[PDB]
Amino acid sequence: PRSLSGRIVGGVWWFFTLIIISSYTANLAAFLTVERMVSPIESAEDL
Amino acid sequence: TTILESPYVMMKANHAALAGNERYEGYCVDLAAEIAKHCGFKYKLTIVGDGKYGARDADTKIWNGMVGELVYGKADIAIAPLTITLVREEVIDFSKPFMSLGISIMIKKPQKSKPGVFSFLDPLAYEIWMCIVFAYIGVSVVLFLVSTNEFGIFNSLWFSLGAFMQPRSLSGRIVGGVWWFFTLIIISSYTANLAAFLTVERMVSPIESAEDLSKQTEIAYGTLDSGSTKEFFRRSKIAVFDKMWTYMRSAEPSVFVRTTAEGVARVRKSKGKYAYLLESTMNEYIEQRKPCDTMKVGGNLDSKGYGIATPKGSSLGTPVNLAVLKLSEQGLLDKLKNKWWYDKGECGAKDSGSKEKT
Amino acid sequence: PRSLSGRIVGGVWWFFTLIIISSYTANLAAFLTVERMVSPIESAEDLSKQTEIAYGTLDSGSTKEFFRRSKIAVFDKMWTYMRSAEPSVFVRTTA
Amino acid sequence: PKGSSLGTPVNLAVLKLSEQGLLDKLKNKWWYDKGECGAKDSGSKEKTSALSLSNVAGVFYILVGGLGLAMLVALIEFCYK
Amino acid sequence: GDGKYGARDADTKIWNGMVGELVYGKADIAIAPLTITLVREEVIDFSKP
Ligand SMILES: O=c1[nH]c2cc(C(F)(F)F)c(N3CCOCC3)cc2n(CP(=O)(O)O)c1=O
Ligand SMILES: O=c1[nH]c2cc(C(F)(F)F)c(N3CCOCC3)cc2n(CP(=O)(O)O)c1=O
């Protein structure tokens, strides 16, 4: 129940994992965004 | 002699306040000065009367346009986008090509942003939706083994509810944890991936070559009702171009247009349902004109080329010929084209994509 | 408890809201990603690499004559643009 | 050679061949028709848009592995009892 | 012979390859991927491309 001791532990640990999974999601979005940014050499100006 | 055809020869802005050669401006206007400089001679730019290029009426057997004014001594030289054809090479002299071209394809700029529920099945692949469902029942069955025939049905429906996502039996406990970590990664992947298309959002186009126009029918296409472009497909014995002509020959309504302006308008008002076939030179120029909603796709269908025309057995013959070769090697020809097509253009293609947002 | 009827309702509704909140998050990211993409005009090379923001000089003076005669890479392109930019990117006075 | 007899004739011949599409035909004969690669060109007609299964697959194996680990922990529990 | 196209040695001022065999009467015509250049158009005749 409301065991304040281990209670804040579950809360802080939750806030901890929240940040991590958010970071993973954000970063993973960037790896696909940049993956598209890489434009193939279509013309000479690209070289 | 020359013809009024943008952007080769055009009337300058304040042409009414000017006279002589200063009245005109364009690719050929500059090309004239260059040729005259290397051949050493003064010249007077004049526009052809009938405003035609160079054809031969079958009946009267009379030449018209610039090619005509050359054969009948009206002009000394022709500096314009005059195509080097066999029928003309017989009556006049053509210098080496100062600009190689051909027949190209013009379509509407793919601004495709339709609904299509298929933009939701793309982020997460159909193959992935499947496996996530197989593993879905693959967990509801493993949990089902953790907990007489009906007792198994009520439980299988309970584990299916423990499946439809949201004590300390270590066995099935780590199953719920691992399955949670599994779905966590997937939903994170879906979210991240979905962010990508809506961020970059680069457009794609169906038709890449001429063979693509023949393999499909959804997108209609045609040429000018009269000209070498239309007569090309009609007489062409090439595989691809043959089928294309067969289609256009009996396509209803008429896929042929009266003028080049009508053709472009048809492409801009068909939402990408109509393609227009025309000379690459004029096409490339159109792409650099507002509202910048047209683009050339794929390479040319044939190899042509314009040249400086001079009366058969003329004195300017050899000189001009060499002059053209000299200009091209000095990259002066390429420079001139860039000046009137892209530099003077109103549509920086890579700049219009760098300056467009959503 | 395990009322199969309303059970799948809670599951499907959960999958529904999952997609929406994921869409909101993803979409909100593109608007912030592009918001950063917009780079402020820092150097002169930035004026040549883009076209959205027009630019010009005084119609007469060493400033204008500079770009015209400049054989430097960046300044060259800049002049090419201003030389044929419409409407006129050049002004009469500094004011 | 400069001032040759074959000069004009050959010139016209080239123009005639091109208009008859004979030149384009010849090129197609030796470049594409006689070519050995219409396979890498038929696949270059198109590659498509979105995500792959590869990455997602790695997370599937770790899942089944977890299920198997549990199926193992389950058996032992019933044995001790 | 030499298996060249058509260049001009600055020193000896001699043409080599096919373009050479044309100027020196070794051959009557050259049918090959010979580039139409200004330096060659001066010594020989090039048909349309
Ligand atoms: O020698 C020729 N040179 C030509 C050059 C051009 C241009 F590209 F504009 F420079 C054009 N246009 C293409 C687009 O439609 C408008 C005018 C037609 C030409 N024609 C007529 P054809 O009989 O239809 O080939 C000739 O005869
Ligand atoms: O008239 C000329 N016609 C040429 C025709 C070709 C080919 F394309 F193979 F037909 C080539 N190659 C291109 C690829 O590398 C191997 C040989 C070189 C030619 N060169 C020499 P350049 O001085 O390098 O231009 C000429 O002079």
UniProtKB/Swiss-Prot annotation, chain E:
Induction: Down-regulated in the pyramidal cell layer of CA1 in the hippocampus by global ischemia. L-glutamate binds at residues 33, 35, 40. It comes from the Eukaryota. The postsynaptic actions of L-glutamate are mediated by a variety of receptors that are named according to their selective agonists. This receptor binds AMPA (quisqualate) > L-glutamate > kainate. Belongs to the glutamate-gated ion channel (TC 1.A.10.1) family. GRIA2 subfamily. Ionotropic glutamate receptor that functions as a ligand-gated cation channel, gated by L-glutamate and glutamatergic agonists such as alpha-amino-3-hydroxy-5-methyl-4-isoxazolepropionic acid (AMPA), quisqualic acid, and kainic acid. L-glutamate acts as an excitatory neurotransmitter at many synapses in the central nervous system and plays an important role in fast excitatory synaptic transmission. This is Glutamate receptor 2. The chain holds residues 467 to 515 of 883 of the full protein.
